[PDB]
């Protein structure tokens, strides 16, 4: 209902309002909770992407405040610097997924607080541009959701 | 056998440029060609793509057509799947294969009824959703669709398959 959701999506200092808009819609369709680590590059009444599709959007001053509030969930970081392909992991309910901001990496110190096998990467072809952040989150969430059989409800608390 | 990209992504009358900006990056990363059925809701041509920074290898795979049928003929009539909320079959039940083409409707309207029904029922696919939700963003739908099909092919990166 408000944190008993399937996965937790954590955006570290996101910068571009439409991306976060599209991630809110994605988390709604997939039953995930969304968490934003300040500072943000936009305020949360802008540009409404297109009542309460968004009310399930928490913001926090620091990564650690978010993770305390969530109960220290199993955490994976999704970075181009990953040591391991995202699809090799056995995801499970309550896992948290941490993504960096659009125009920069996730800080070195955040990435290195995670075990090596939990710094994950999507298949990035050589010489290519980065993927859009929202598409990255969608692909990550839908792969983890697929491993759970696209389960819709139980529990919906 | 006449497929030199992994998949073919076809946008029917795309309206919102950032969605197509995002899908160009996804197709480049996954090794897919991208085809846009006119009219578009925005400007797109090789000069604009070059002003963005794409060189010949990258924007040669981004092409426009007048009609859906003109596009399919240019591709050799590949197996075609259409991705819609009115689909009958869940998108993850298909066994995809190299050279498959994926058709997506516009942001505002979804595919024309006559386009959707031109396809066999078992190739009208839907993505899973919470009950009573609005569709996913068009570029998220494409990303999610392509990466599931690509996962089935082991994420083969530019493998020299015929």
Author numbering:
A (entry chain C): 1 to 50, 56 to 162
B (entry chain A): 1 to 162
What does the paper say about this structure?
To produce a protein knot without open polypeptide ends, we chose the highly conserved bacterial RNA methyltransferase as a model system, namely YibK from Pseudomonas aeruginosa (PaYibK). YibK contains a trefoil knotted backbone topology. PaYibK also shares 65% sequence identity with one of the most-studied knotted proteins, YibK form Haemophilus influenzae (HiYibK), but contains only one tryptophan.
